[PDB]
Design an enzyme around this catalytic site. Structure first.
Site, PDB file in Angstrom:
ATOM      1  N   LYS A  98       0.857  -1.181   0.000  1.00  0.00           N
ATOM      2  CA  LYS A  98       0.000   0.000   0.000  1.00  0.00           C
ATOM      3  C   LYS A  98       0.894   1.232   0.000  1.00  0.00           C
ATOM      4  O   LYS A  98       1.966   1.211   0.606  1.00  0.00           O
ATOM      5  CB  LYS A  98      -0.921   0.014   1.225  1.00  0.00           C
ATOM      6  CG  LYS A  98      -1.720  -1.263   1.432  1.00  0.00           C
ATOM      7  CD  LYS A  98      -2.781  -1.416   0.357  1.00  0.00           C
ATOM      8  CE  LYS A  98      -3.539  -2.719   0.503  1.00  0.00           C
ATOM      9  NZ  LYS A  98      -4.695  -2.801  -0.425  1.00  0.00           N
TER      10      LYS A  98
ATOM     11  N   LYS B 107      -2.343   1.470  -2.875  1.00  0.00           N
ATOM     12  CA  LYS B 107      -2.817   0.584  -3.936  1.00  0.00           C
ATOM     13  C   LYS B 107      -2.151   0.936  -5.265  1.00  0.00           C
ATOM     14  O   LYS B 107      -1.757   0.057  -6.029  1.00  0.00           O
ATOM     15  CB  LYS B 107      -4.342   0.667  -4.043  1.00  0.00           C
ATOM     16  CG  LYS B 107      -4.973  -0.194  -5.144  1.00  0.00           C
ATOM     17  CD  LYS B 107      -6.496  -0.030  -5.167  1.00  0.00           C
ATOM     18  CE  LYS B 107      -7.107  -0.534  -3.865  1.00  0.00           C
ATOM     19  NZ  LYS B 107      -6.812  -1.979  -3.651  1.00  0.00           N
TER      20      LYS B 107
ATOM     21  N   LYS C 239       2.298  -9.453  -2.024  1.00  0.00           N
ATOM     22  CA  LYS C 239       1.663  -9.483  -3.328  1.00  0.00           C
ATOM     23  C   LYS C 239       1.529  -8.084  -3.843  1.00  0.00           C
ATOM     24  O   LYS C 239       1.375  -7.141  -3.039  1.00  0.00           O
ATOM     25  CB  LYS C 239       0.293 -10.139  -3.225  1.00  0.00           C
ATOM     26  CG  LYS C 239      -0.687  -9.342  -2.374  1.00  0.00           C
ATOM     27  CD  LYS C 239      -1.977 -10.119  -2.117  1.00  0.00           C
ATOM     28  CE  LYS C 239      -2.797 -10.262  -3.391  1.00  0.00           C
ATOM     29  NZ  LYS C 239      -3.226  -8.996  -3.946  1.00  0.00           N
ATOM     30  N   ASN C 240       1.617  -7.918  -5.159  1.00  0.00           N
ATOM     31  CA  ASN C 240       1.115  -6.711  -5.795  1.00  0.00           C
ATOM     32  C   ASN C 240      -0.321  -6.493  -5.371  1.00  0.00           C
ATOM     33  O   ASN C 240      -1.082  -7.453  -5.263  1.00  0.00           O
ATOM     34  CB  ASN C 240       1.174  -6.822  -7.325  1.00  0.00           C
ATOM     35  CG  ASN C 240       2.515  -6.415  -7.904  1.00  0.00           C
ATOM     36  OD1 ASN C 240       3.059  -7.109  -8.764  1.00  0.00           O
ATOM     37  ND2 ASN C 240       3.038  -5.272  -7.470  1.00  0.00           N
ATOM     38  N   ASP C 241      -0.704  -5.243  -5.128  1.00  0.00           N
ATOM     39  CA  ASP C 241      -2.119  -4.917  -5.083  1.00  0.00           C
ATOM     40  C   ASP C 241      -2.631  -5.144  -6.497  1.00  0.00           C
ATOM     41  O   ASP C 241      -1.892  -4.936  -7.463  1.00  0.00           O
ATOM     42  CB  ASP C 241      -2.373  -3.488  -4.606  1.00  0.00           C
ATOM     43  CG  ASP C 241      -3.668  -3.359  -3.820  1.00  0.00           C
ATOM     44  OD1 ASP C 241      -4.582  -4.181  -4.038  1.00  0.00           O
ATOM     45  OD2 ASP C 241      -3.773  -2.442  -2.980  1.00  0.00           O
ATOM     46  N   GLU C 242      -3.895  -5.535  -6.624  1.00  0.00           N
ATOM     47  CA  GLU C 242      -4.392  -6.100  -7.877  1.00  0.00           C
ATOM     48  C   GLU C 242      -4.208  -5.230  -9.134  1.00  0.00           C
ATOM     49  O   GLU C 242      -4.041  -5.783 -10.221  1.00  0.00           O
ATOM     50  CB  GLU C 242      -5.879  -6.470  -7.725  1.00  0.00           C
ATOM     51  CG  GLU C 242      -6.867  -5.303  -7.542  1.00  0.00           C
ATOM     52  CD  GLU C 242      -6.971  -4.809  -6.103  1.00  0.00           C
ATOM     53  OE1 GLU C 242      -6.674  -5.590  -5.173  1.00  0.00           O
ATOM     54  OE2 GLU C 242      -7.361  -3.640  -5.898  1.00  0.00           O
TER      55      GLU C 242
ATOM     56  N   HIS D 205      -6.717 -13.779  -8.036  1.00  0.00           N
ATOM     57  CA  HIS D 205      -7.374 -12.623  -7.411  1.00  0.00           C
ATOM     58  C   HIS D 205      -8.754 -12.368  -8.040  1.00  0.00           C
ATOM     59  O   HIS D 205      -8.884 -12.312  -9.259  1.00  0.00           O
ATOM     60  CB  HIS D 205      -6.493 -11.384  -7.531  1.00  0.00           C
ATOM     61  CG  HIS D 205      -6.901 -10.262  -6.628  1.00  0.00           C
ATOM     62  ND1 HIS D 205      -7.953  -9.418  -6.909  1.00  0.00           N
ATOM     63  CD2 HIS D 205      -6.382  -9.838  -5.451  1.00  0.00           C
ATOM     64  CE1 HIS D 205      -8.071  -8.528  -5.940  1.00  0.00           C
ATOM     65  NE2 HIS D 205      -7.128  -8.758  -5.045  1.00  0.00           N
ATOM     66  N   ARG D 206      -9.776 -12.206  -7.206  1.00  0.00           N
ATOM     67  CA  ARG D 206     -11.169 -12.221  -7.664  1.00  0.00           C
ATOM     68  C   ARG D 206     -11.897 -10.864  -7.733  1.00  0.00           C
ATOM     69  O   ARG D 206     -13.126 -10.827  -7.657  1.00  0.00           O
ATOM     70  CB  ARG D 206     -11.972 -13.161  -6.772  1.00  0.00           C
ATOM     71  CG  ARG D 206     -11.870 -12.809  -5.317  1.00  0.00           C
ATOM     72  CD  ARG D 206     -12.803 -13.641  -4.505  1.00  0.00           C
ATOM     73  NE  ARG D 206     -12.892 -13.172  -3.130  1.00  0.00           N
ATOM     74  CZ  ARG D 206     -13.705 -13.698  -2.223  1.00  0.00           C
ATOM     75  NH1 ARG D 206     -14.522 -14.684  -2.565  1.00  0.00           N
ATOM     76  NH2 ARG D 206     -13.725 -13.211  -0.989  1.00  0.00           N
TER      77      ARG D 206
ATOM     78  N   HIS E 270      -8.495 -16.165  -3.169  1.00  0.00           N
ATOM     79  CA  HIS E 270      -9.084 -15.408  -2.076  1.00  0.00           C
ATOM     80  C   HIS E 270     -10.473 -15.926  -1.708  1.00  0.00           C
ATOM     81  O   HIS E 270     -11.366 -15.986  -2.553  1.00  0.00           O
ATOM     82  CB  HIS E 270      -9.166 -13.920  -2.435  1.00  0.00           C
ATOM     83  CG  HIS E 270      -7.835 -13.235  -2.504  1.00  0.00           C
ATOM     84  ND1 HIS E 270      -7.552 -12.093  -1.786  1.00  0.00           N
ATOM     85  CD2 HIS E 270      -6.723 -13.510  -3.224  1.00  0.00           C
ATOM     86  CE1 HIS E 270      -6.314 -11.708  -2.042  1.00  0.00           C
ATOM     87  NE2 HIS E 270      -5.792 -12.547  -2.917  1.00  0.00           N
TER      88      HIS E 270
ATOM     89  N   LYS F 121     -13.259  -6.434   6.640  1.00  0.00           N
ATOM     90  CA  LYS F 121     -13.973  -5.238   6.190  1.00  0.00           C
ATOM     91  C   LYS F 121     -14.969  -5.523   5.073  1.00  0.00           C
ATOM     92  O   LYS F 121     -15.852  -4.713   4.797  1.00  0.00           O
ATOM     93  CB  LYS F 121     -12.977  -4.197   5.678  1.00  0.00           C
ATOM     94  CG  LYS F 121     -12.389  -4.562   4.304  1.00  0.00           C
ATOM     95  CD  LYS F 121     -11.305  -3.606   3.839  1.00  0.00           C
ATOM     96  CE  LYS F 121     -10.853  -3.967   2.425  1.00  0.00           C
ATOM     97  NZ  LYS F 121      -9.699  -3.159   1.939  1.00  0.00           N
TER      98      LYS F 121
ATOM     99  N   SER G 286      -7.684 -12.178   3.070  1.00  0.00           N
ATOM    100  CA  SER G 286      -7.403 -10.770   2.844  1.00  0.00           C
ATOM    101  C   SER G 286      -8.669  -9.927   2.914  1.00  0.00           C
ATOM    102  O   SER G 286      -9.762 -10.382   2.568  1.00  0.00           O
ATOM    103  CB  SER G 286      -6.749 -10.572   1.479  1.00  0.00           C
ATOM    104  OG  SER G 286      -6.351  -9.223   1.287  1.00  0.00           O
TER     105      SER G 286
HETATM  106  O1  LIG Z   1      -7.332  -4.076  -2.120  1.00  0.00           O
HETATM  107  C1  LIG Z   1      -7.617  -4.681  -1.063  1.00  0.00           C
HETATM  108  O2  LIG Z   1      -8.595  -4.284  -0.361  1.00  0.00           O
HETATM  109  C2  LIG Z   1      -6.807  -5.874  -0.621  1.00  0.00           C
HETATM  110  O3  LIG Z   1      -5.470  -5.754  -1.080  1.00  0.00           O
HETATM  111  C3  LIG Z   1      -6.811  -5.945   0.890  1.00  0.00           C
HETATM  112  O4  LIG Z   1      -6.184  -4.757   1.439  1.00  0.00           O
HETATM  113  P1  LIG Z   1      -6.217  -4.569   3.047  1.00  0.00           P
HETATM  114  O5  LIG Z   1      -5.526  -5.649   3.800  1.00  0.00           O
HETATM  115  O6  LIG Z   1      -5.584  -3.320   3.537  1.00  0.00           O
HETATM  116  O7  LIG Z   1      -7.589  -4.545   3.619  1.00  0.00           O
HETATM  117  C4  LIG Z   1      -7.410  -7.151  -1.206  1.00  0.00           C
HETATM  118  O8  LIG Z   1      -7.336  -7.083  -2.605  1.00  0.00           O
HETATM  119  C5  LIG Z   1      -8.864  -7.315  -0.813  1.00  0.00           C
HETATM  120  O9  LIG Z   1      -8.949  -7.829   0.491  1.00  0.00           O
HETATM  121  C6  LIG Z   1      -9.535  -8.295  -1.769  1.00  0.00           C
HETATM  122  O10 LIG Z   1     -10.792  -8.695  -1.232  1.00  0.00           O
HETATM  123  P2  LIG Z   1     -11.144 -10.244  -1.135  1.00  0.00           P
HETATM  124  O11 LIG Z   1     -10.019 -11.109  -0.693  1.00  0.00           O
HETATM  125  O12 LIG Z   1     -12.242 -10.549  -0.191  1.00  0.00           O
HETATM  126  O13 LIG Z   1     -11.587 -10.850  -2.409  1.00  0.00           O
HETATM  127 MG   LIG Z   2      -5.811  -5.348  -3.063  1.00  0.00          MG
END
Ligand SMILES: O=C(O)[C@@](O)(COP(=O)(O)O)[C@H](O)[C@H](O)COP(=O)(O)O
Ligand SMILES: [Mg+2]
Ligand SMILES: O=C(O)[C@@](O)(COP(=O)(O)O)[C@H](O)[C@H](O)COP(=O)(O)O
Ligand SMILES: [Mg+2]
Lengths: 454, 455, 92
Positions: free
Chosen positions: B167, B169, B192-195, B288-289, B322, B330, B369
């Protein structure tokens, strides 16, 4: 956590954001879940989870990061409306050729924000892409013009392409399949695989392709007119798509330019569409959207609308995409969906929220399909305003009492009836068209109350 | 048109259909739209539009076609339940290798039937695949075992993998990004890379990959422990995905088996997932979904649930996917989602409607996550029952008051706390990083541990 | 083409202006024009990219986007990479 001070700036002018050309705009219908933050707070968290942030403050954040933040610039809580501006620097680019990808657009604008716990629902109704980003998308390489050219029609306003889908959806063996093709082609122009048809154990791909190619030659020899076929090449594996397409074009040989490729773009994904678009740019790319209804339905308040899907499909490079029957067929749809077609055919058009200039990007054909038959078309054409398109009627053609050929001719005559501005019942000096009343009497009863008397 | 006589056979027994091994079974929650046909009529049309038919009779139908018809074999209108049996002969197969494709499964089982005018809504909750069809799917080629092996952990019950997401993102340039990686790796295992992170103009792919590789080398030299990274290689273009994976593996060289590839499988589609699975079977495929919530949310009555998606992801060959925080984070989720993890990890498991034997198909890792941190972890593990998984906490790690490394260590200590069966607040007295998480997220602390402050 | 059934200019050349250029009983022969009918015309690739895309990149109208000011880097050969790039920068 309230992030409104960072991610919301309602003093920004949409006209200026548009004029600047550095922002993607997206319009959502969103509703906060009861028991959390208010509308702008929720919108702020929504923007954060869709661009640069998360649900808490992190020390790794710097001003450069804040510089590329997406921002809520317009809200209307009474109508649950929310508009967000995404700096274009956010969107991923190919290392190999620097072009855009719709996958990044999806990941950012309608991705994780669909899983937010503090949001009851949020759905996209429109988006605007400025030139710098727009020009990076493939766009269509082949259009209806090439089909018109093959059919020997004018390349400008070449008119209505009579199509069908081979029914049964599944179950026909290679030669019966080719026989139904031959039959329809005696009166019609265009045939497509039903979306799941491919390499079933009872209908192997190559045998069917060979039989259909023979059927195409026999039909063209018999009628003296060119015939078109749209083959399903959808697969998980890129190389399978390639194998199928290559076998088809090689097999059809001198009729190779009579071939379209169908891709189940919604369930298989943009990657399959791009595989076909980039591997076979000289073949009409037919985007089939099976499954889309899970999100595009007005019953759904999540994901995105059919309009958004179609505009994306135009960016992805579909030569044609199904836009639905606009309320006139068996699927969910509205007459106002005529606006979707205009968005994909014109160089400039209005969405529900944003005006879009396409800068000469090729058009995408609106493909009309879903419970259509000879009786239902005049009403459809009246709503749309033109017949420069492909229409496929499976049941409407093969459900004709006199067989596929008569069904085809009934469709042809139905469009001739619409272009002449004549009354269908009075027009029905045309046997095949008239027999559609007898083919589908319930429809006939509904559309033309006293057709029997006349 | 009433098609019940053809496409419905309620006299069929589920146990025999299962015993037969010639049918895929699907269970839907469906409701007819008012002003059309009844439940069985609508179910019959649903089946017609999902197999061999349409909305009217066609002269082209033969007995062979009728032989491969799908069938409604169970209904419960009071509960809006509808079960359909699909002959496996219906599903498309590769010309090149005769293997199955999930795209066909989707086109038939949850495709056009989602657009039907006489249906208000229909959502798939479970499905069963028989051996003859099951065995034709790729399945996972790499598993968590290989990460455990790389980390020097036991390949059986190798334990908890401490993870994070970089982070912001988006917004970090290559070296600050790599600096954040280095920071986290001093206390954690996995990043991991953020998506959406990839080849943004302000963060070119190759520079970032090189900077991260250098960060990995420096961190492994610093800690004397192995570190893992999951790179996003998602693209529209197959050849872009190949270009990215190939550059990463060549660049990381002797650390190449420390690398996972992340794919945004829902928005990019099964084809991208399969591209990664087949092009890089020896690299952990991280599914990643993003976007799934549009259909998987209980607020939605269309498409399919997260359970279905996960089971498909296991079939597609995801090394890990995931599964959500199961109500502890959250995002929207429930404790019963613990059942999903079991479905993707075990060789035999129960769905909401169908029992599934996997016949030794490799397991898929539950990747946890979404708003997780050290304070919230004990409850999740209590609900799940094990810690043989990867957990990534972005905000939970980089939101730690003392930075990413302390956050990582706080997560580590949190799992040690759960495994030691100790009381968190009493445990916090002897573990600073864990204790500072209370001060990092005080509202979380207030709700989870009412009087932590006094202690 | 076996692979896609499309045309090749090589065959057109081989036939229309090939061996007949070596005939001993002919002093000279030169083609001044040729016509391709639709059935043959539609089998050629044709351009996939046009000036419109350059106009688009330049921010000009994609129809009648106007004059594109161009040059060729001179010397024809002899500039090493950075002097080459300096000439490019200067002209741009
Ligand atoms: O972008 C985000 O929010 C995250 O990197 C989490 O960040 P944080 O740890 O700071 O919350 C994950 O991609 C989400 O949790 C995906 O949701 P899920 O796994 O339910 O599909
Ligand atoms: Mg993410
Ligand atoms: O039922 C089918 O699957 C069809 O072949 C219609 O056949 P019929 O003409 O016989 O009804 C088309 O795929 C749908 O119209 C696609 O849905 P949409 O256009 O809405 O995306
Ligand atoms: Mg169809």
């Amino acid at each position: 956590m309230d992030q409104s001070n960072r991610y919301a700036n309602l003093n920004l002018k949409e006209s200026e954001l548009i004029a600047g050309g550095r922002h993607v705009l997206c319009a959502y219908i969103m509703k906060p879940k009861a028991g959390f933050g208010n509308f702008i707070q929720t919108a702020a968290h929504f923007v954060a989870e869709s661009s640069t942030g998360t649900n808490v403050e992190v020390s790794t954040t710097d001003d450069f990061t804040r510089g590329v933040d997406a921002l809520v610039y317009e809200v209307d809580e009474a109508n649950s409306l929310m508009k967000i501006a995404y700096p274009i620097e956010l969107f991923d680019r190919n290392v190999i050729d620097g072009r855009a990808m719709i996958a990044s657009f999806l990941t950012l604008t309608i991705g994780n924000n669909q899983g937010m716990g503090d949001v009851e629902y949020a759905k996209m109704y429109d988006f605007y892409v400025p030139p710098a980003y727009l020009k990076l998308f493939d766009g269509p390489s082949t259009t209806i013009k090439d089909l018109w050219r093959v059919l020997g029609r004018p390349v400008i306003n070449g008119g209505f392409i009579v199509g069908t889908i081979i029914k049964p959806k599944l179950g026909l063996r290679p030669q019966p399949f080719a026989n139904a093709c031959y039959d329809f082609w005696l009166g019609g122009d265009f045939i497509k695989n039903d979306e799941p048809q491919g390499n079933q154990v009872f209908a192997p791909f190559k045998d069917t392709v060979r039989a259909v190619a023979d059927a195409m030659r026999r039909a063209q020899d018999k009628t003296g007119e060119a015939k078109l076929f749209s083959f399903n090449i959808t697969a998980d594996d890129h190389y399978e798509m390639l194998a199928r397409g290559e076998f088809i074009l090689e097999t059809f040989a001198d009729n190779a330019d009579h071939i379209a490729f169908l891709v189940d773009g919604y369930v298989a994904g943009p990657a399959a569409v791009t595989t076909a678009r980039r591997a076979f740019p000289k073949q009409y790319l037919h985007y089939h959207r099976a499954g889309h209804g899970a999100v595009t339905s007005p019953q759904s308040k999540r994901g995105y609308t059919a309009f958004v899907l179609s505009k994306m499909a135009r960016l992805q490079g579909a030569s044609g995409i199904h836009t639905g029957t606009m309320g006139f067929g068996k699927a969910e749809g509205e007459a106002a969906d005529r606006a979707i077609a205009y968005m994909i055919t014109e160089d400039a058009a209005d969405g529900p929220y944003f005006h879009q200039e396409w800068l000469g990007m090729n058009p995408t054909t609106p493909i009309i399909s879903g419970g259509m038959n000879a009786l239902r078309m005049p009403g459809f054409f009246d709503n749309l305003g033109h017949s420069n398109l492909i229409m496929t009627a499976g049941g409407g053609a093969f459900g004709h009492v006199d067989g596929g050929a008569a069904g085809a001719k009934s469709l042809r005559q139905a469009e001739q009836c619409w272009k002449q501005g004549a009354d269908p019942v009075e027009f029905a000096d045309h046997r095949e068209f008239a027999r559609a009343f007898e083919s589908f009497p319930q429809d006939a009863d509904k559309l033309y109350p006293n057709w029997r008397a006349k």
